[PDB]
Amino acid sequence: DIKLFGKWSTDDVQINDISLQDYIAVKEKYAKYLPHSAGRYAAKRFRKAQCPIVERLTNSMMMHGRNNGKKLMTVRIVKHAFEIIHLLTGENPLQVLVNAIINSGPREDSTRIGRAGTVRRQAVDVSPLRRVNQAIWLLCTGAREAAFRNIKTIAECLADELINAAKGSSNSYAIKKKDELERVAKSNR
């Protein structure tokens, strides 16, 4: 059997939306043991649609300068974050990644129109892959800004921001920036 980080179970999780069912990974096959597969998903267009979602959260956690090249910092941090999550909510920690992706992603977003220096935005709507990507961005950035100096472990602070991104609370930096995007979308229309 295939068990994530040795203690989890991937095949029992669920997806409630049709748009994010075709993109978000780790359901049927793609489920692996460890996040780092060192594969090439940027090789061709939408070939990064199929890589494991946990690896996807993993790749984006190196995103600031000193942490850049070090990938393992993440498969460390993503390790303790899941094991924290299961203690709080008490559900499959890979259900919490699904719900945070689904809720944190924008829906409608604004595209800047005008001349440089004058921002006048018009509302368009997000593509599924773009939804996933922006969502995960928001998750990692929310975790960083929240964890800079509170002296929180990023394990603790990402479990925080993830569970909060899943529940729908305004605690998550993620849900915040989403809510701003949708609201500007409302402003314009």
Binding site: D17, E108, T111, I113, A123, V124, V126, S127
Partner: protein, 61 residues
Amino acid sequence: PIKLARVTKVLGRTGSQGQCTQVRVEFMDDTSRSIIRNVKGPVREGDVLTLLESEREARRL
């Protein structure tokens, strides 16, 4: 109301800087209604878009 949508065809890319994709929308409610729509980020045919404002139509940027 929240709605769902299907991608029938990809037409061109609207944008100043070439940002938006201009795509064609079927409704997943089995209705035959056909509306053009602006979408951001990568789109390939067959995908489903969630519309918060479902009666809106596409304009050229």
